Amino acid sequence: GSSGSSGNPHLLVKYHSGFFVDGKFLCCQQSCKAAPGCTLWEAYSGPSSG
Ligand SMILES: [Zn+2]
């Protein structure tokens, strides 16, 4: 058997850098409540890849 020396099955998890008001988010303001994380690892400015 292989018990494994891992910590958790979830490694790629996101969160909401906002709040939940009027049944709508303030960070992304998605349509549903259980929507997929909005705060993704991205940025406008950065060393473009060549
Ligand atoms: Zn959000």
UniProtKB/Swiss-Prot annotation:
Tissue spec. comment: Highly expressed in cells with great migratory potential, including endothelial cells and metastatic carcinoma cell lines.
UniProt binding sites for Zn(2+): H16, C27, C28, C38
PTM remark: Phosphorylated in response to protein I/II and to LPS.
Position of the signal peptide: none
Induction: Activated by IL6/interleukin-6 through phosphatidylinositol 3-kinase (PI3-kinase) pathway. It is likely that activation occurs through binding of phosphoinositides to the PH domain.
Subcellular location as annotated: Cytoplasm
Zinc finger (Btk-type) boundaries: 8-44
Domain remarks: SH2 domain mediates interaction with RUFY1.
Subunit structure and binding partners: Interacts with BCAR1, CAV1, MYD88, PTK2/FAK1, RUFY1, RUFY2, STAT3, TIRAP and TNFRSF1B.
Family: Belongs to the protein kinase superfamily. Tyr protein kinase family. TEC subfamily.
Protein's job: Non-receptor tyrosine kinase that plays central but diverse modulatory roles in various signaling processes involved in the regulation of actin reorganization, cell migration, cell proliferation and survival, cell adhesion, and apoptosis. Participates in signal transduction stimulated by growth factor receptors, cytokine receptors, G-protein coupled receptors, antigen receptors and integrins. Induces tyrosine phosphorylation of BCAR1 in response to integrin regulation.
Designated name of the protein: Cytoplasmic tyrosine-protein kinase BMX
Organism expressing this protein natively: Homo sapiens (Human)
Gene name of this polypeptide: BMX
Shown chain mapped onto the complete sequence: 113 to 149 of 675
